[PDB]
């Protein structure tokens, strides 16, 4: 009756950072030393919980969120930081209690001659709220003059592509991220 963690971590293809997926786990047996004692996870750090103490803690609900971001950008995944992701893409409330995982997936996502399947927002009027996401692709407004759906001046399409490539520097190499939130 073990939890489906495997299909989340051994999944085929991940979503984009601005359109991250969300899954609910409840009424299940979850083991973590199998996840904890793995050399795969280049980065693995938790908050408010001892990583060894998970087996002693029960919860009503567990939420798993995943996406794909650039390598030298994982630092933005922490409660109380700034940056494009932490501003317009994914927010972490400071009262966070859960683990954050990230490992290099260069051999799974990057492709020769650019991979143009992953996006991220660049413009938005106001910052996000904790555990909140948006998908709308309305043309951004940057001045008092309204343009009404034309990408002329001061009206920019708010989505750009990462364009991963398997020969880039390790800073730009892609990274998969899994975020756990608790009761």
């Amino acid at each position, epitope marked *: 009756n073990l939890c489906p963690f495997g299909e989340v971590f051994n999944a085929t293809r991940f979503a984009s950072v601005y359109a991250w997926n969300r899954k609910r786990i409840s009424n299940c047996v979850a083991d973590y030393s199998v996840l904890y004692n793995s050399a795969s996870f280049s980065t693995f750090k938790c908050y408010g919980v001892s990583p060894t103490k998970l087996n002693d803690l029960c919860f009503t609900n567990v939420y798993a969120d995943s996406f794909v971001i650039r390598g030298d950008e994982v630092r933005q995944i922490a409660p109380g930081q700034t*940056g*494009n992701i932490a*501003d317009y893409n994914y927010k972490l409330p400071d009262d966070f209690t859960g683990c954050v995982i990230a490992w290099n997936s260069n051999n799974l996502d990057s492709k020769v001659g650019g991979n143009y399947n992953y996006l991220y927002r*660049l*413009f938005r009027k106001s910052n996000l709220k904790p555990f909140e996401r948006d998908i709308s692709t309305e043309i951004y407004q*940057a001045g008092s*003059t309204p343009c009404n759906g*034309v*990408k*002329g*001046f001061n009206c920019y*399409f708010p989505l*750009q*592509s990462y*364009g991963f490539q398997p020969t880039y520097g390790v800073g730009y190499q892609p990274y998969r991220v899994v975020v756990l939130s608790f009761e």
Partner: antibody
Amino acid sequence: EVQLVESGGGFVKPGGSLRLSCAASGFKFSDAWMNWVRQAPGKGLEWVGRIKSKADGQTTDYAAPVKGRFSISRDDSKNTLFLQIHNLESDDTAVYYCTTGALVESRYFDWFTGYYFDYWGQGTLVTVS
Amino acid sequence: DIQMTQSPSSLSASVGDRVTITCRTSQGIYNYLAWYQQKPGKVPKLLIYGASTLQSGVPSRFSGSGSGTDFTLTISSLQPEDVATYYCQKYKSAPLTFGGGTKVEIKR
């Protein structure tokens, strides 16, 4: 300060093709939008095409009497722009420029959007005989 | 296809006088327009943008005034070193089409 240089003009003969180039100097040229403008002898200027930044589509917007010809392409990793004149008829005899424009930033990122043209090259002269 | 005119074309007055240049438009553009100056045999140079903002480092005798559907650029006083052709450019969106062009001569 920053400069752009172009080359490739010659005393060519019609019924063929020609390749023109423009090399950037001090931009963050990987992500900027660049333009070509062709000044005919003794006539006004005329915009002839734009190419995006390849991080936002790498699309091309040509002019109304141009759509059929004058292909534009970008070669990164060496900071070079490329205008491909697909066919010369008579009136391609003109001068050509490579220009960029406004700088726009929101909080973190900035890039020459190229909407009103600030920096111009010396301008190479093309002929049809 | 918003047609624009830059009229007239033959303009000339004794030094110190005032000149009017008018970039009319067929469709409304809020304030998006620039002006370029090009002396004979050289690259054009920028003067204005937003229809009124002077360039940082250009003489301040040019007056970008209008907005809406008809614009005016006027030189406050004439000098003999500022004879060139001036170009008004539509600026809202593609296809960034320039203007016809106006030359300025000098009086007798």
